[PDB]
Amino acid sequence: MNRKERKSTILETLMGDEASNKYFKRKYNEIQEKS
Amino acid sequence: SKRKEQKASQRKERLKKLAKMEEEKSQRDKEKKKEYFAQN
Amino acid sequence: PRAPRTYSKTYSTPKRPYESSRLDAELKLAGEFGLKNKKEIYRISFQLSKIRRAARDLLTRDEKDPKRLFEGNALIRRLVRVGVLSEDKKKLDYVLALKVEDFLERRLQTQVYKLGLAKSVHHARVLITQRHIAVGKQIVNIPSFMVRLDSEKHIDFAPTSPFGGARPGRVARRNAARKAE
Amino acid sequence: KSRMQAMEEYIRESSDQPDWSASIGADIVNHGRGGIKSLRDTEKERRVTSFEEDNFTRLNITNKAEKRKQKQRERNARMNVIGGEDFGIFSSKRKLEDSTSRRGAKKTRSAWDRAQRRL
Amino acid sequence: SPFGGSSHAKGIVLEKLGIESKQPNSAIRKCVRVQLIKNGKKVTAFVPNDGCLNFVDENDEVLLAGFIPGVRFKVVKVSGVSLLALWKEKKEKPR
Amino acid sequence: GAEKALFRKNKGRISRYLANKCSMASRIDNYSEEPSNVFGSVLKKQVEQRLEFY
Amino acid sequence: GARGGAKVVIEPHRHAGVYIARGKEDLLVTKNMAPGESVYGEKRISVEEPPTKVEYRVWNPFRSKLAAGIMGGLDELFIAPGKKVLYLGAASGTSVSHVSDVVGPEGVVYAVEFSHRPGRELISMAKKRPNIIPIIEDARHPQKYRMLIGMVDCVFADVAQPDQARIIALNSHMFLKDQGGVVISIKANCIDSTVDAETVFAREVQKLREERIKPLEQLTLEPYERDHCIVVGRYMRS
Amino acid sequence: RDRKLIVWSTESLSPVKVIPTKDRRGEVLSLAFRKNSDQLYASCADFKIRTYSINQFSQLEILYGHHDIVEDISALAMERCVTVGARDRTAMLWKIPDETRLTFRGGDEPQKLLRRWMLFFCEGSIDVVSMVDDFHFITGSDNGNICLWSLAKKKPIFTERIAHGILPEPSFNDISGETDEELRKRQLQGKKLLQPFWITSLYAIPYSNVFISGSWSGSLKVWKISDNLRSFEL
Amino acid sequence: SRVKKRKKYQKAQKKLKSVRAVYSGGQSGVYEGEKTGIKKGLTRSVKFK
Amino acid sequence: RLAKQYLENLKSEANNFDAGDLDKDIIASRL
Amino acid sequence: NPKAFPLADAALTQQILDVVQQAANLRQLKKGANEATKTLNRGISEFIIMAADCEPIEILLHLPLLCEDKNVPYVFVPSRVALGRACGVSRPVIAASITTNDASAIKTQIYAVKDKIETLL
Amino acid sequence: TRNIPQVSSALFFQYNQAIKPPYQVLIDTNFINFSIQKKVDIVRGMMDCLLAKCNPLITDCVMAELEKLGPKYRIALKLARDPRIKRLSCSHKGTYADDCLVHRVLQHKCYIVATNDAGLKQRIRKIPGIPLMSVGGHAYVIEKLPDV
RNA sequence: GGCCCAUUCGGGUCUUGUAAUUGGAAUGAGUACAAUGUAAAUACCUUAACGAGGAACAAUUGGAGGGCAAGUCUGGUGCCAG
């Protein structure tokens, strides 16, 4: 992976991934509707 | 929590099938102990 | 009238059709070789049983007997022409070591799948039943055709078939005609 | 009657004379529905053609004589030939030894007959 | 043998003894009294269901086959037509 | 050597062509107890013929 | 998957000297005896420790049959810290280096090889690991190199030969301790391709037993390899 | 290799017809005219023989039976044309009207040849064929073997091993790059690397007792067959 | 019958990779680790007593 | 040996001229 | 002693050159030195075939190192020139690789030849 | 550490796709006696039953239970020691055979078990892919071998 | 999320599901121009054109489980049970 993508801690690398963020924003909205 | 619920769902289905098999092995077992002691 | 005729069955129902090991045995044999039914498995088991029974009877006879030698060598010569037994197993004990899977491997549909002419065993069966496969020069639509070695190499696509050099099928020419129109 | 099929193939391998093999596709009876034509039945048909060529006319098969010359000849196939070579002669039982045996009157019967043979 | 050597026996439908039963598809509602023709002995027979009970009527030919314990006979066949064919809307009873 | 351009459309063809021959020279050098330059000298010469044509 | 920036958590395995790296994927890894380099191009972890930069190597189970056994879940692995190990059939440092990592500096690895060509790289690997003793000699004749091997606690034999059981026995009698470890890798095709795998493994466990090895375990190495297993046994001289 | 059989007028080399083989692998490898006839027989790489009537410019029939490519083809006055199947190491003679074939195999092995002697190379392929006679034909193998055949016998009646000799041994300066002289010599492996010349050509004058073989040894060898047709000499 | 049994066999193939591991050509490309995770305290081991 | 005895047995089971050959000659002369 | 070792005898080469030929027909054959290396790198090579008269030999002695690391058989034929036609290809081949396929039409004689190659080794 | 034994790779569910001719058959103590009783002596009695060559194996235990039997069962001992009968040596303390016989088929799915003791039969019936052969009537019978 | 095993509690395992959309090919039954065939004719063989997405060009048989009402009946220790 590229130097810019690299992060000191795991979570920031998960922050750069746009697909994980899009995937999850859908799920959090869906669960809150049920709650 | 959806997966733990799935186990309980297939749990109930199996034990009904399970309680069917033991019933057959109970009735057929009584039959054998009638044919066996028929000789005796 | 005139004399009647001798005909017999090519198969026999198993001793017990209902043991689970048997059932899943036909399951995987069918699935891997893509058969229609268990009738073919009973067929093939029938001749494999006949062949092994003859081989066992020939084993029981002492070495160098006219019977054992003549008929055992004839079993093995024919079993090697069918391609089931390789040239290096020219012995009758290795006839007794045979299994149904080898015969099934000799079935033409296996070869049509296997050489690369078809991409699924069911596709191979469809191609055979659809007049696309020629063993040498002659068209066969029976998947149960067993193949010899010299016949094994001569499996090709038909001259009359659209994929083998003939004109496109009805669907292709129909589509081209409507496209032109 | 004396001929036993399994014996003559040994002559074929030991003859050292070629065998006149036919084409791969020319042997199948009917699109594969009938298996590869056995060696014997190829010997019978050529008799028809070698018979048919000279007579100048074909031979039709009578409706009666029909009813005992194709089915069993193509059902012995379905019982016994799997790929144009017969699996049937073995389930059958025959005394081939008589065919092998020098049963003729010219047979070793006394010590002097065999000694003359050894000469 | 229940039929004295035969696999099936015809009879005469006398009266449907379970018509007055309240409970639908009760075991009783499928019971019918039948006169065996070969000897005239009255017997009781099973009809597959209350829907099939509609098809059977009094003074029709009925064939009986081996099967409310004790009712050993079932009605398989009536008046030129088999019940299951009628029950599947595959046929009409001839009259 | 594509990060420091050690071997460096027509230019790329020469770079690969030299890469193929460099692989061979390593094989000769590595699996020879006393490697010589006789094969290296010629194996450079075809590269020179290769260069001239392009 | 395991890409350069991706960060992992190293935590110990059940077996001493074996470690697990967590993340989006889980990796079997062993600490590097020679930090800063890879032996067969394998993947590496570097951890900052008070700060010293300790280094850990990725163990590819497909390449290493022993690692596939760990993935298979071996109950007992005699290869452990402070233990002498005799590695038979050491083609190169692909697996021996990892075994060298597990034993540690206190331990040593007696790597035995026959073919000269793989031996040269194995010797080059052997220098970088002071604990590895390369023996480029035929394992069928342990008397040839009895001169070079001291008394050993465990024997690992990955020789792909038909006469492996004889090789294992002779080395076990000469070198292996009483109650010592025996761990073998068996391929069916080389020993006997005519018959199925299962009968072969039954035959091999039989041969070990006349040789006074008590076999403890067996593991087929699927999904990583067809027709393998690892059998673990104890040498019962008495 | 264009999968076409085209005909020209002899006078002007003007093309009059093209006959496609109608096969992707039907690369024609040899052509033989029936002597004193318009019949043409074509051997094509798709394991088949194509027979044409050139006066009609039409295809007649196809022959099937060969285990590998049909490299060569030779015919005489009658229609009994002979073939060789390359890696098949088998020679096949054809009756076009009857459609049957006679199949001929070599079946020699260096193991037995050496023991009877007490460099013999196993045949890898038959390369050429020419019909000496309507009842006799000769073949050339890739091991340098010239074999005489008869319709009576499957096996060769007489064979001439390494007819064209052995190829020159590779130079020691090229086998390896090692500096020392002796190291490169070991790479030669004595005489184990040496291989025989291939029989690229083999032609027999029809109905005669002599035939000619060809290779790149640098010379055409003329052979004479015995009066009894049981052997031949150089 | 042929289409039904094809779905039955492939389904049974889906069924066995659940109960036990099967080879799928081995490693394909770079080794990307154990996808399903590693269980430290679990052994799948068939023990000789 | 056993093969030869069968051939000798077969030969036992099985001025010189052939009736068919004479017919064939007339057929050939007509040809 | 020789670098080209083991070298198949006259007979064994013929069966090897046979299995090579049907493989070319069945698309199971990767030929040339670098393709052999690639088939080796991915571990799809059941065994490789190389030529003993390569000029020079040293340009294919990498492959024995690769195979013996991983336990793949290898064997030498006297002629790179002969190994060409068996591949079905218009130029000489010094090294070729038959790949692993349990789904191939020609498996039986491959394992027969693959049986012999280890015995030679 | 928890241990969950792997299901053998020789099993597609409860079919054993490894046992093929020639077979390996283990002999139980009762089997030799019943074979003598029905006069179905050992090697061919299989050959008729299975139509394949098998390799009879007698364990150190089974050779031992045959030999606890005593002078009344001498015939079983000489038949048990036939050279065609190979021997499967044992490395467990107990001489108890029924646990001995079953435990091998637990490891390796490559054997048939020969037995008439009802004590030992159902143990083999739960475990998948272990064909079970017995002597009944006038000849041997094989229950869980579909290849027959 | 799929599934396996487990009287019991639970345990084991990973690319699975569609009761979603979509694309181009092949051909058989049928619709049939012919020749051949034959005392004539039927038939057989061969052979022009047309012929598939619900490919409705719409095979069956038997068995095992469900679930639904402002529905009906019966018995009881609310809201249950049959």
From Swiss-Prot, chain E:
Cystine residue pairs: none
Main location: cytoplasm
Subcellular location: Cytoplasm
Effect on the protein of changing P24A: Lethal mutation
GO cellular component labels: cytosol; cytosolic small ribosomal subunit; ribosome
UniProt superkingdom: Eukaryota
Cross-link (Glycyl lysine isopeptide (Lys-Gly) (interchain with G-Cter in ubiquitin)): K16
Mutagenesis / variant outcome for changing N25A: Lethal mutation
One Gene Ontology biological process: translation
Modified residues (3,4-dihydroxyproline): P24
Post-translational modification: Hydroxylation at Pro-24 affects translation termination efficiency. The stereochemistry of the 3,4-dihydroxyproline has not yet been determined.
Keywords: Cytoplasm, Hydroxylation, Isopeptide bond, Ribonucleoprotein, Ribosomal protein, Ubl conjugation
Single Gene Ontology MF annotation: structural constituent of ribosome
Presence of keyword Ubl conjugation: yes
Subunit relationships: Component of the small ribosomal subunit (SSU). Mature yeast ribosomes consist of a small (40S) and a large (60S) subunit. The 40S small subunit contains 1 molecule of ribosomal RNA (18S rRNA) and 33 different proteins (encoded by 57 genes). The large 60S subunit contains 3 rRNA molecules (25S, 5.8S and 5S rRNA) and 46 different proteins (encoded by 81 genes).
Record family assignment: Belongs to the universal ribosomal protein uS12 family.
Miscellaneous comment text of the record: Present with 10600 molecules/cell in log phase SD medium.
Name by which UniProt lists this protein: Small ribosomal subunit protein uS12A
Location of this fragment in the whole protein: 41 to 144 of 145
From Swiss-Prot, chain H:
Domain of life according to the entry: Eukaryota
WD repeat placement: 23-62, 65-104, 121-159, 195-233
Signal peptide interval: none
Assembly information from the UniProt record: Interacts with UTP25. Component of the ribosomal small subunit (SSU) processome composed of at least 40 protein subunits and snoRNA U3.
Similarity-based family: Belongs to the WD repeat RRP9 family.
Further comment found in the protein's record: Present with 5130 molecules/cell in log phase SD medium.
Domain-level remarks: The WD domains are required for nucleolar localization and U3 small nucleolar RNAs binding.
Role noted for this protein: Involved in nucleolar processing of pre-18S ribosomal RNA. Required for efficient pre-rRNA cleavage at sites A0, A1 and A2, and biosynthesis of 18S rRNA.
UniProt-recorded name of the protein: Ribosomal RNA-processing protein 9
Full protein: residues contained: 256 to 510 of 573
Swiss-Prot record, chain K:
Pfam families: Ribosomal_L7Ae
Signal peptide: none
A GO biological-process term: spliceosomal complex assembly
TM region positions: none
InterPro entries assigned to the protein according to its UniProt record, in alphabetical order: eL8/uL1-like, H/ACA_rnp_Nhp2-like, Ribosomal_eL30-like_sf, Ribosomal_eL8-like_CS, Ribosomal_eL8/eL30/eS12/Gad45, Ribosomal_eL8/Nhp2
Effect of mutating V77L: Impairs binding to U4 snRNA, but not U3 snoRNA, and causes pre rRNA processing defects and an accumulation of unspliced U3 snoRNA
Subcellular location: Nucleus, Nucleolus
SUPFAM superfamilies: L30e-like
Alphabetical list of PROSITE patterns matching this protein: RIBOSOMAL_L7AE
Variant or mutagenesis effect after changing E55A: Impairs binding to U4 snRNA, but not U3 snoRNA. Causes pre-mRNA splicing and pre-rRNA processing defects
Cysteines engaged in disulfide bonds, as pairs: none
Function, as annotated: Common component of the spliceosome and rRNA processing machinery. In association with the spliceosomal U4/U6.U5 tri-snRNP particle, required for splicing of pre-mRNA. In association with box C/D snoRNPs, required for processing of pre-ribosomal RNA (rRNA) and site-specific 2'-O-methylation of substrate RNAs. Essential for the accumulation and stability of U4 snRNA, U6 snRNA, and box C/D snoRNAs.
Protein family according to the UniProt entry: Belongs to the eukaryotic ribosomal protein eL8 family.
Stated name of the protein: 13 kDa ribonucleoprotein-associated protein
Organism encoding this protein: Saccharomyces cerevisiae (strain ATCC 204508 / S288c) (Baker's yeast)
Swiss-Prot record, chain L:
Any single GO CC term annotated in Swiss-Prot or TrEMBL for this entry: nucleoplasm
Keywords noted in UniProt: Nucleus, Ribosome biogenesis, rRNA processing
Entry annotated with the keyword rRNA processing: yes
Annotated PINc domain residues: 23-122
Signal peptide boundaries: none
Subcellular location: Nucleus, Nucleolus
Single GO biological process annotation from the record: endonucleolytic cleavage in 5'-ETS of tricistronic rRNA transcript (SSU-rRNA, 5.8S rRNA, LSU-rRNA)
A single MF term (Gene Ontology): RNA endonuclease activity
Coiled coil segments of this chain: none
Top-level taxon: Eukaryota
Record carries keyword Nucleus: yes
Subunit structure: Interacts with FAF1.
Family (UniProt): Belongs to the UTP23/FCF1 family. FCF1 subfamily.
Function as written in the Swiss-Prot or TrEMBL entry: Essential protein involved in pre-rRNA processing and 40S ribosomal subunit assembly. Required for the early cleavage steps of 35S rRNA at the A(0), A(1), and A(2) sites.
Protein name, per record: rRNA-processing protein FCF1
Organism placement in taxonomy: Eukaryota, Fungi, Dikarya, Ascomycota, Saccharomycotina
Gene field: FCF1
